[PDB]
């Protein structure tokens, strides 16, 4: 039985915009449970956003997390962005909402409830677990059945 919690994440997208889906893959108790949802018209950085999203939002208790990911977007703005953001009212110099705020602040709520330890990987040099979600994430786009409400060509 593992003492931390472990979540992999990719999201994938055929477009800008295009159908896009997400793979997530959760070791929490003594499971594994596997996310993968495709939306309609979504994008990629939306979908690399909803992956850990939901792997998050799926744990009902304060947790000891490690996330591994490729994902730059959610490297860029864990690492560089948020901290900002959340200073700045989560605006732009300009003074407008940020890009894909309603995840940022459904991602901030969730990373709120926890401690977490991210693993950057390089796409090329993940672990199974990685790939697998590749895959998943992948297969989603193909076959898409959710509505991606959040989108905006917009703002």
Known sequence: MLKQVEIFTDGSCLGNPGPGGYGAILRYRGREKTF???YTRTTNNRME????????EALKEHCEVILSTDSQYVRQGITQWIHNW??????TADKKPVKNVDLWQRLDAALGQHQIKWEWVKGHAG???NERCDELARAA???????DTGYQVEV
């Open 36 to 38: 993968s949802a495709g």
């Open 49 to 56: 956003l909803m992956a850990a999203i939901v792997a998050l």
């Open 86 to 91: 959340k200073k700045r009212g989560w605006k």
């Open 127 to 129: 672990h199974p677990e």
């Open 141 to 147: 786009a193909m076959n898409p059945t959710l509505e």
